[PDB]
Amino acid sequence: KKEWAHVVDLNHKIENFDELIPNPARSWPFELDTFQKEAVYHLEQGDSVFVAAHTSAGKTVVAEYAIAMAHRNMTKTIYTSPIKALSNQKFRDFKETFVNIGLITGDVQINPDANCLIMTTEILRSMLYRGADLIRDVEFVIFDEVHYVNDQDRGVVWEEVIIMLPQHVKFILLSATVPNTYEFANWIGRTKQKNIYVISTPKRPVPLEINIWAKKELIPVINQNSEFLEANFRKHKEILNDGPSKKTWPEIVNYLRKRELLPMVVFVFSKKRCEEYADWLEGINFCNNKEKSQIHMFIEKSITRLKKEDRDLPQILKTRSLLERGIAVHHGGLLPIVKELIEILFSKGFIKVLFATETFAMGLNLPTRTVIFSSIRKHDGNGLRELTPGEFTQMAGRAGRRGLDSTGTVIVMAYNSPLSIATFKEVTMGVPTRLQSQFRLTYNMILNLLRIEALRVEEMIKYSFSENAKETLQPEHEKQIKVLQEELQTKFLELMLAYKEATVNLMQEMVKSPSILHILKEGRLVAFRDPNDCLKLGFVFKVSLKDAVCVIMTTKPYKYFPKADGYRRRNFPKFQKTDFYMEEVPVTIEVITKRKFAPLGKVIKKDVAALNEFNAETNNILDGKTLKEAGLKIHQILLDRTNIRDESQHIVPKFKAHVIKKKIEELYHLMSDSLLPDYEKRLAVLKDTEFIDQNHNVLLKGRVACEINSGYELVLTELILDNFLGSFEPEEIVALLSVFVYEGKTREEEPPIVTPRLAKGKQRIEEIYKKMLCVFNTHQIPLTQDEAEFLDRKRFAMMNVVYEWARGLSFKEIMEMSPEAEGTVVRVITWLDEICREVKTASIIIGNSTLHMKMSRAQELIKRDIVFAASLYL
Numbered sequence: 001k002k003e004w005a006h007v008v009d010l011n012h013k014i015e016n017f018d019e020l021i022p023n024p025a026r027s028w029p030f031e032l033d034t035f036q037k038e039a040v041y042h043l044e045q046g047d048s049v050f051v052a053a054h055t056s057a058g059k060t061v062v063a064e065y066a067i068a069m070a071h072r073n074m075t076k077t078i079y080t081s082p083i084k085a086l087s088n089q090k091f092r093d094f095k096e097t098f099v100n101i102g103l104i105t106g107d108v109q110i111n112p113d114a115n116c117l118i119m120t121t122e123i124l125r126s127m128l129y130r131g132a133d134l135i136r137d138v139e140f141v142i143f144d145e146v147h148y149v150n151d152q153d154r155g156v157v158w159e160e161v162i163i164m165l166p167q168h169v170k171f172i173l174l175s176a177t178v179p180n181t182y183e184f185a186n187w188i189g190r191t192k193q194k195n196i197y198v199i200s201t202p203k204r205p206v207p208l209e210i211n212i213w214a215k216k217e218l219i220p221v222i223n224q225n226s227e228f229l230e231a232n233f234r235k236h237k238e239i240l241n242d243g244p245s246k247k248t249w250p251e252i253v254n255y256l257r258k259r260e261l262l263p264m265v266v267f268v269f270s271k272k273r274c275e276e277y278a279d280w281l282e283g284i285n286f287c288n289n290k291e292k293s294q295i296h297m298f299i300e301k302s303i304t305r306l307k308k309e310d311r312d313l314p315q316i317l318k319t320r321s322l323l324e325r326g327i328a329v330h331h332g333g334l335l336p337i338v339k340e341l342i343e344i345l346f347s348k349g350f351i352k353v354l355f356a357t358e359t360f361a362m363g364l365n366l367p368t369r370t371v372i373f374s375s376i377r378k379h380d381g382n383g384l385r386e387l388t389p390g391e392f393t394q395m396a397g398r399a400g401r402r403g404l405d406s407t408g409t410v411i412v413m414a415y416n417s418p419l420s421i422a423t424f425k426e427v428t429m430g431v432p433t434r435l436q437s438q439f440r441l442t443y444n445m446i447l448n449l450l451r452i453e454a455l456r457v458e459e460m461i462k463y464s465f466s467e468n469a470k471e472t473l474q475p476e477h478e479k480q481i482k483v484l485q486e487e488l489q490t491k492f493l494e495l496m497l498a499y500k501e502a503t504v505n506l507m508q509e510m511v512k513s514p515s516i517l518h519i520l521k522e523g524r525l526v527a528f529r530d531p532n533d534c535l536k537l538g539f540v541f542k543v544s545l546k547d548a549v550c551v552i553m554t555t556k557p558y559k560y561f562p563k564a565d566g567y568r569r570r571n572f573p574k575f576q577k578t579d580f581y582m583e584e585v586p587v588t589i590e591v592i593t594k595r596k597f598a599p600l601g602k603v604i605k606k607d608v609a610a611l612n613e614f615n616a617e618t619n620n621i622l623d624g625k626t627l628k629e630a631g632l633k634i635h636q637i638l639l640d641r642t643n644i645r646d647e648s649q650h651i652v653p654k655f656k657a658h659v660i661k662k663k664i665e666e667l668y669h670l671m672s673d674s675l676l677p678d679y680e681k682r683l684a685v686l687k688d689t690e691f692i693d694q695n696h697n698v699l700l701k702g703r704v705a706c707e708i709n710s711g712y713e714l715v716l717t718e719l720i721l722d723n724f725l726g727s728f729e730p731e732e733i734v735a736l737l738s739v740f741v742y743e744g745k746t747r748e749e750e751p752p753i754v755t756p757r758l759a760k761g762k763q764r765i766e767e768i769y770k771k772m773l774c775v776f777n778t779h780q781i782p783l784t785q786d787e788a789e790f791l792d793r794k795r796f797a798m799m800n801v802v803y804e805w806a807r808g809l810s811f812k813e814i815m816e817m818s819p820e821a822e823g824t825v826v827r828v829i830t831w832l833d834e835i836c837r838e839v840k841t842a843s844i845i846i847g848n849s850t851l852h853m854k855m856s857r858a859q860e861l862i863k864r865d866i867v868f869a870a871s872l873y874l
């Protein structure tokens, strides 16, 4: 009866809305869309909202409203998103929109006494665990980019956060259009006992047009009404009938320029190729003198902080070169400050051509007039594969600027060969991506909750999305089993069914080895099952292993077993005949008879001769005899089958009962398997390695691990627990620690480790990790590919860089010896600061003040220059 999540009908309207709101906490130059009105309304009622709105609709408006309320009730509104890189920006967007707002990061903290705070989800979780005091004064928590999914991002923890939030906190979840919003809104509302209204939109306010660029021509293939244009696509194919060349970009750039479809963002899934393509625009310029000067001034003003040695970095000079001509690239290889320059200049209208990797499309709020896909295929750790509809929608959706563009232009590049239609339709018009739960158990979480209170973990698991999902399913499967249990209420089968499965198995097995084409030579009379599973007989005519389908000349369906005379007589009487037809049949054929027909093609023509022959043969085959049958896998399979072997109008019921048993048995397991198993395993793991004792008390070791929130808490704890690091220099320690924050995917050969101790340290960590893996294996706990291949990658490749950096080398010299691009160097080194902080705290717990001192020293050594430059957004 009681519902906590309420779906707001799209057909619903608020004509008297302007009257319902007496004193709107905020107003805008424009007129709010119905969904925004819904949002504001339900917010003012004192309820929660889950807004899943198309790209270009204006979700931020709901965020600003909320905030406003916080400034009207002396309450606090915390804004959160999983994307840390986008904290500084959002913090600047609100400052320029509203007026005290703060910013909470790991090291930097600005204006905490504000009625609004910007922070990542992790920081919020952290504050929750901490039990911060300001949370008692928080009324609204905004969860932005709820649809954000990233496997390599450990900060997507809004579920844990929502579970942990106190009862007096109301929610505002912002998301792209997803199909399963109600699920999560219902979990939230039910689990939190909160009225939450699910709000969405019918379509994109700024409609997209999807085009293909082929042979210097722009061809529409999906119109504003999302209709696929077959003729045009075929046209592209025909025109063409294989990647960017030197003339590619100048040509399309020039084409779009004459037609004023700029600025353009070109998505390129490769940093190198971004830069290459950008370089291919040599001699093209979009900036007049004043613009060049403004840009120069902005850059000069922005980097004046840095030392001269950093201002003159090659990447900076090259970037300036591009920027002063209205061109840029955007990718993870760039120094943050450079990224920021590019972003700020792009948002202000100084950049007309931007080549960007996928990241640019996710967080950043920088829409463009035109979006181009250099390719709709991207390589992920798995390899090369087509983009998913969600990704394509995410990138393509950037192409419409509400208020500036009538429409958003999206272009897919074709080069020398046509794009496949299935691929293209799957990528551009595939089923929209669903919200998935990101909630996982970690040792850190378990140790912390366990340290807090005995059954906190169980409680956390009870209130998770998975559990609630299981709860939602339970009754459904109950009714299904009720119908089945009642439906039924109103050895032969085992061996037989097994025999069927065995024959199917063997058949599937024979479909791999070409040798089959010898057994299924044109004319091989066989008894097979049609789609309706009716036994029939026919001669083989074609064998396409590529499609694994055989064309047969067919005996009407019979609505046996090799060498089963009596069994045949009793079970299988004479079959019926029917005009021969060519039927396509799947290999997975109940029996391959010894009978072979001497050309069918002549029977297909109905030549009197072949006709008579066929008639006689068929009549003969259908008249008398009973069917006779006739690698290493097929051998064993056949053996087992024969073992089972040695082992008409009445089998219907039994068969039905079997079907039932299968269904029910199936619906049973469907309620068996999920966090509790993992949890038990993890407890076992923590018990074996002594983070907790036999009674599940958290030991000192576990209290140390509680402080490491970076991913490899157990191994790191193990590393720092004793005094192996006793004779290491701060530089050496921070150098060695880089292994826990570097993917180690460099495609270059590792040079000699710069010091002996570092080599020893690598050895030590490797050993620790091996042991830990052994323990993971013992308790059959599933590993992520990273955990698994950890040692198979070059994770230690950054030790030298970090060492030399801690020694005082300039970034220039650092880069001259780095196996990774600037951005990654900065990523590693900036993460190491946090690592050092964690280790400091840990050392406090351990009582090792020397280690503490060293870590402080390391922080002091690495925390400098362009690597730690203040954000341009602040």
Ligand SMILES: Nc1ncnc2c1ncn2[C@@H]1O[C@H](COP(=O)(O)OP(=O)(O)NP(=O)(O)O)[C@@H](O)[C@H]1O
Residues within 6 Å of the ligand: 030, 031, 032, 033, 036, 053, 054, 055, 056, 057, 058, 059, 060, 061, 176, 365, 402, 403
């Ligand atoms: N009701 C409105 N009428 C006219 N303009 C609006 C309206 N609402 C928002 N805008 C403007 O259009 C833009 C809205 O974009 P935004 O706030 O980021 O939502 P969004 O497009 O859905 N973000 P995202 O989906 O992640 O890409 C802002 O620049 C607003 O100024």
